[PDB]
TrEMBL record, chains A, B:
Annotated catalytic residues: 190 (proton acceptor), 317 (proton acceptor)
EC number(s) given by UniProt: 4.2.1.40
Record: residues binding Mg(2+): 218, 243, 266
EC category name: lyase
GO molecular function: glucarate dehydratase activity; metal ion binding
SUPFAM superfamilies: Enolase C-terminal domain-like, Enolase N-terminal domain-like
Family to which this protein belongs: Belongs to the mandelate racemase/muconate lactonizing enzyme family. GlucD subfamily.
Taxonomic lineage from the root: Bacteria, Bacillati, Actinomycetota, Actinomycetes, Streptosporangiales
Keywords for this protein: Lyase, Magnesium, Metal-binding
Protein name: glucarate dehydratase
Domain of life: Bacteria
InterPro entries referenced in this protein's UniProt entry, alphabetically: DgoD-like (IPR034593), Enolase-like_C_sf (IPR036849), Enolase-like_N (IPR029017), Enolase_C-like (IPR029065), GlucD-like (IPR034598), Mandelate_racemase_C (IPR013342), Mandelate_racemase_N_dom (IPR013341)
Span of domain Mandelate racemase/muconate lactonizing enzyme C-terminal: 168-262
Length: 420, 420
């Protein structure tokens, strides 16, 4: 039958190091919302989405209105989510995934349920979710090493095992650590933190220390058009791609026409309404897809086809996340021929924290093998979920705010947008 | 397990009346190829594609190379088809579905297998194919009445029950007949047969006889740009859309900018490589999708999303076909929010001929209810299949050739392309 009997919604918080970015610095707790869909038959599916309060409220509201719907009825579930969301538009405090909009809000709320319904469908059919998307075309999905400038620890808290990284030597050392542990064969540096000249230096140091590894640089729109063109030209032959150097479709397109490497985004093209203007102006050669705000795995796959058709290559964006998201990202990437670049992930930074069981997701030579077995291939660890929910209850954070947190230390700071 | 054990490929021929079009006249037999996929477990799926010899040869070749592959492994099946097809490009004799190309050839061969694999997946899960595409968003799929100018019968053969239609009165009478039987609430006229002024007259006669019913006119590119603009303007406020008035993206875009109704095509945009040029020039407001040459139901659904995003509405193209195709068309349309116009079908012209059982596909008030039960919801009638295969064996036709057939009667005829 496969009617939804109940939907359990659990906000969670987990530890995050002081990773610097254009919007400030990550807070000591990152938030997520875990969704568990249960059918009248007792088959369960998992999904995972943002933990910000306004989003959480919508997810709760939508979840309350899904019982009685069938898990194959994704169009109808999507319409029900759209009804709950109405014209409410949920906007985050950092802008690092671009502008908010109605459709993006609906897609963000829908995605945790869609992923859980696909998990259930996979379980019913006894197949991995990748088989629901046409079957895996690769056995394992390569991920990049996501490097950050960072403090040694959060002020007023213990220093972490990763150490500080505030110049090229530190960044190279961080890379050795991550590549040594996970085997990553691609490297991404989060920029927009230091003057561009210093971040270019870090990129060069990485190229020298790791010959042959594709490199990416992402200042989250911290640069002007002129600065972007200077840096792009100065990094000729070094970057796989330059990600969001400058804000806006117009600025991005102007940069793209004057630098030698392709530009990528997860800021100026973040919902389907953006695509026609993007095809016309060509601000990018590479779109980072993200099922968490493009509306689930199936909608993401549709956009992948659309991109390939217009000659836009695909990569994948990440936000701090747990293993349900990692499993979903991996089945999506494994089953989508057009996702050809290494995917981003924050996984190393969460240092083993998770709400699923241990032996399903592993990195081997920088890549995650598509899970064995039905559905997502992961199993909820209910005690770990309880532990993280208790942390959410007393962590004192309810909405991600990198900028507010940075301002607690430097009152004059503001999110860097066309700043250098 | 769901490994393909065998694939049965059966060419069939069935009776077709002398329907006139820009390329001449339909021959007395229409050809199709029926595909039946059988898993190691004995679960069967059906697909249906063109019967032209060169296509049939590719379908046979591909079918021989599918055993051992899993029915969920659609990406891998697609790659295997691409391997079999190589750089062979199969081109038909009439051009009524636009130019041939490698991808289109691969998609045409792949589609009969994809539809059969989805039928099997639906059977395994006990769900209709529409549930594999997100669930039906409408209970029944509206179809148009497909009107043709036609002779009373094929020369040297018995006249058919439909009668001749060679002027506006005849066309209106044909419409009364079809609408009376099937309940169609939209009307399409096949043109490019008579001078445009006479076909415009038929369109006007239809509007007067059937107030409120959307009307379409399709001359299959028989007109020049100037003639197209004249007719378009003369039919202001009458047409839902004007379909392929003139050949080529350039000509279509020039017409589209000077006529009051949207243009549609199944000739200048017929494979994904066409879409970027189409988005740039805007030759159309409406694309007729057709899973038989866009590469199956899932790929068709992807293109539907792409169209909606760029503001191109969707309709559906038909070629003479049987109930496996009708079932597939109906599940696709029912599960695709963007397919909003009535779909085309040749069903009435086949006057009950079919290779599936009787009680699954019916027209009620012009629309086909999505079938009840698992998979496509149709059951092969093996005796009917044998009957039509025996007809193929002795029908003396191996490739559709409307133009050659018309030339047997009028040696000076040539397919009309920018002729009026
Ligand atoms: Mg980015
Ligand atoms: Mg047409």
């Amino acid at each position: 039958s496969m009617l939804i009997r109940e939907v359990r919604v659990t906000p969670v918080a987990f530890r995050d190091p002081p990773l610097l970015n254009a919007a400030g610095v990550h807070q000591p707790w990152a938030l997520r919302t875990i969704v568990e869909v249960v059918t009248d038959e007792g088959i369960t599916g998992l999904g995972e989405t943002y933990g910000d309060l306004a989003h959480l409220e919508q997810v709760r509201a939508a979840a309350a209105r899904l019982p009685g719907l069938d898990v194959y009825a994704l169009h109808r579930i999507y319409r029900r989510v759209a009804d709950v969301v109405g014209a409410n538009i949920v906007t985050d405090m950092h802008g690092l995934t671009g502008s908010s909009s109605r459709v993006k809000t609906v897609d963000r709320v829908f995605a945790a349920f869609e992923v859980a319904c696909l998990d259930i469908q996979g379980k019913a059919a006894g197949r991995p979710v990748a088989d629901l998307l046409g079957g895996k075309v690769r056995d394992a999905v390569p991920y990049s090493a996501y490097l950050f400038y960072k403090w040694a620890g959060h002020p007023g808290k213990p220093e972490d095992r990763f150490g500080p990284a505030l110049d090229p030597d530190g960044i190279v050392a961080q890379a050795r650590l991550l590549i040594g542990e996970y085997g990553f064969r691609s490297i991404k540096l989060k920029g927009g933190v230091f003057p561009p000249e210093q971040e270019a230096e870090a990129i060069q140091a990485l190229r020298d220390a790791f010959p042959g590894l594709p490199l990416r640089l992402d200042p989250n729109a911290a640069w002007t058009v002129e600065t972007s063109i200077r840096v792009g030209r100065a990094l000729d032959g070094v970057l796989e791609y330059l990600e969001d150097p400058t804000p806006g479709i117009d600025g991005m397109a102007r940069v793209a026409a004057e630098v030698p490497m392709p530009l990528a985004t997860n800021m100026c093209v973040v919902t389907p309404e953006h695509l026609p203007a993007a095809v016309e102006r060509r601000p990018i050669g590479v779109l980072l897809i993200d099922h968490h705000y493009w509306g689930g795995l199936v909608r993401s796959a549709h956009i992948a086809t659309l991109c390939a058709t217009f000659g836009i290559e695909l990569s994948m964006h990440s936000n701090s996340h747990l293993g349900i998201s990692l499993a979903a990202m991996t089945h999506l990437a494994a089953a989508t021929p057009a996702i050809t670049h290494a995917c981003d992930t924050h996984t190393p930074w969460q240092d083993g924290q998770d709400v699923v069981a241990p032996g399903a997701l592993r990195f081997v030579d920088g890549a995650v093998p598509v899970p064995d077995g039905p559905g997502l291939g992961v199993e909820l660890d209910r005690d770990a979920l309880a532990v993280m929910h208790e942390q959410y209850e007393r962590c004192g954070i309810r909405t991600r705010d990198d900028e507010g947190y940075m301002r607690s230390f430097d009152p004059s700071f503001s999110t860097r947008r066309g700043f250098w």
